Symmetry: D2
Subunit: 271 residues, 4 copies
């Protein structure tokens, strides 16, 4: 496997893309430190939350590949507990090489329906949770002295833009900034830091009231409806496609790639 003997720390691992990364990296020989909030999301979020049962299933899948996994229910906004969990994982698994900062939320809203609390919540999770993840993981990669690879999941919205969520777009741009900023200062440790920018991905972020919320928002400005048009026939990527790119970024075959924005969007950022 491409990641034999390695240990990856992955947030938002209970389902969707985060589960896809855990499962892919375990298959490549990595042991896993997996976290998810596994509970209530901000009230502007229209789809269903993840559950402790979801995270148990990620655990089951990773063990079925014969790898060790340390999993915990924790909010990426809770820096002290996140730091504690990472330290407990590393003590247990012996090292840390890879961070995937994947936990995030989306909430379609017309600009003038976004309350201060709404803005705060999305920014807190998508940016501060992302910064907390690097801050919990990086000193443990540095201590090993082997170099490493940190992948921050941004969005197509964080390279170009996405309409009907001012907070989300801001937050995903902030993630681009976090990648370039952490890349510059962590590069002397041979730690690569890169951001990944998916278009629409087939995950439970499409569940609950998402379709309705998107539908309602679009009505407020129909001129903005083609911002996510791809060049390929596909509008939607599978979580495995994102895991493909993130696996490559984790692997030694991207050892010279850092500070980069990697789109996996069937071309829509150039549309």
């Amino acid at each position: 496997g491409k990641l034999e003997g390695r240990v990856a720390f992955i947030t938002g691992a209970a389902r969707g893309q985060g589960r896809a990364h855990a499962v892919r990296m375990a298959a490549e020989g990595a042991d896993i430190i997996a976290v998810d909030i596994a509970g209530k999301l901000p009230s502007c979020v229209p789809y269903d939350p993840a559950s402790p049962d979801d995270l148990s299933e990620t655990v089951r899948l990773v063990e079925a590949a014969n790898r060790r996994i340390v999993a915990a229910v924790v909010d990426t906004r809770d820096f002290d507990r996140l730091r504690k969990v990472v330290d407990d994982g590393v003590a247990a698994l012996g090292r840390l090489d890879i961070i995937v900062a994947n936990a995030g939320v989306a909430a379609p809203q017309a600009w003038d329906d976004i309350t201060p609390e709404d803005f705060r919540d999305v920014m807190d999770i998508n940016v501060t949770g992302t910064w907390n993840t690097v801050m919990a993981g990086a000193p443990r990669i540095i201590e090993g002295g082997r170099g490493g690879s940190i992948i921050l999941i941004s969005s197509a919205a964080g390279m170009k833009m996405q309409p009907f969520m001012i907070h989300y777009t801001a937050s995903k741009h902030a993630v681009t900034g976090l990648a370039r900023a952490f890349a510059a200062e962590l590069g002397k440790h041979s730690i690569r830091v890169n951001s990944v920018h998916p278009g629409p991905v087939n995950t439970p972020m499409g569940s609950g009231d998402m379709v309705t919320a998107v539908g309602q928002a679009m009505e407020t400005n129909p001129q903005l409806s083609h911002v996510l048009t791809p060049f390929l026939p596909d509008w939607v990527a599978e979580p495995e496609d994102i895991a493909d790119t993130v696996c490559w970024l984790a692997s030694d075959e991207s050892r010279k790639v850092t500070a980069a924005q990697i789109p996996v969007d069937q071309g829509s950022t150039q549309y």
Copy 2:
């Protein structure tokens, strides 16, 4: 003048570039709604704070140009107070056409010296404050039915990156995201939203211990010393050079320009 009969809402107006904008737009015929925190900055900020007296001196300068000014001591993180101040100002001056979201802080710090507090404070002011500013002002532009122009002050850091301030670079990227996102949804009201990206500017953001904080950070990674190198002979722009660009963006001579990132950096973002 290029802004006869217009009204501009300018944040961070007590000194530096914010004062230069007020003075420049006043000279152009605009009445002003000016706000500043005029007091203690986050503990990670190494330079000196502004005072209420700094804000009064901006008031004097604008009145000396024979223009009207409404001014208030207010934190851009305080949405409730900011909306009230804007609403009273617009009631007093008759309309709103222009927003310059200019209040911001900088703090040189090694990445591993940024506490959760420091990160939060820089993010809250540079992003949340910026968002609060548009939210308080844009409805007043809309109701006038004339279109208008909103300028968000980002940084070179928000187009490329700047080392030794993870929070700052992330926040200024977020500001790029705010300008594109607000441009997309407000465009139907004929409201332009653009961001401006200065390199170093000759302001009191250079005051107190800033040069010291800079050298101390630079010491942690000398390889990063040349990120801000210009193509022109000059490393530093004057606040009036930034006012030059923001005035163009406020004027009817940029009516078709929106969602843009305008650098004023002597070429450094391409260095």
Copy 3:
């Protein structure tokens, strides 16, 4: 007048945007060196060519503003004649401060209908002609020892992309590269070099004949139909709108701005 005493060299001056630059900079007090091919364009170009009479009309409009103007029929691909025309102009007018490299062509074609000759003709005009223009003018700017300002006209296509003209998008990207490259080496002379990226502009390039060509190419791929969608209500800028931006770039009010890509596209490059 913002350009009193200055001299500007403008290509593609016979009509459209180039004429609007001449007229505007004349109104601001500059004398003008104006050239145009004023004759046949490559066969892939679907709209009507300019004529000697068109250039003569630009001359009269410039003379009407009480300015001096040296005008000549010349192909920007003709490096020797372009250099002599500049040299003659500078001998007559005393100096050179400003370059607007505006001459260019557009040709909608399905990717597989572009012949080698078509690709060559579009590249030669849009890239080599632009490069010849800088090589003919920049030595005379340097000679004066006053600094100066060079504006290359690219396109939204050269920031993002435009479908159905592989040559044109490539050429306009080359223009972004020319600007950054010349900015880097000419900056030591205090010569700024920037690129300007219009969306659709209301000029003879966008004639009926063009519309037909655009419709034909579009039929080959309907999904690519919304690449030029604006955030503002207007899809088309006026040539005066572009002249507003290029004038600001020529003026001392942008003395710190170099290597920049300035869009005038109502938001479309972020759509």
Copy 4:
């Protein structure tokens, strides 16, 4: 073998990165159509040209990997010959899946030492040769009806800029544009088109008088010396590092990635 049963068409295959792509893709199970000028380079080029013997050695290595290879000495500027070579290769090998447009030249020169001939030569090769490559291969990928993957080799210069080669920088931006424009019209055939942007690579592009040419150009503007500074400790990548990224883009593990600019530059485009 990530590429069993596939056929890749690779230009500049006699040595350096082109040979590394041939060798790697053959190891991954692909058969090869390989071309190289294998002779005289433009006179502005300071390093050593390749020879027919170099190309024969590439043939030797692919054959030793137990793969089939069709190789020819041909200039990418020659559309007629290049197309005929591709056609003979596809008649022999059965199909075409992958294109690596890698043939390119570099020439350090102060801006005012670039002759019209130097400019045209660098442009014809890096841009027209690249376009000719796609035009010769893409119809063949289309006729197979299986989708495919086109990788254009640009440079870090084509994402940011590189000093002391106006032509080179312009050509590599043009390559960025080509990737986007072709991605747009070929995506309906499930053909991805992407560009790859290396920083310095350890190849014979460093041979002959390259070191001298670089040092001499640098003397004309010492301010520009740090444009290629990395965030990682290494300034230089190996051709295998680039082959890693091109291999990934050729593979099914980047099936949703198109119109992307992929830097392999240790972070220098964000420096």
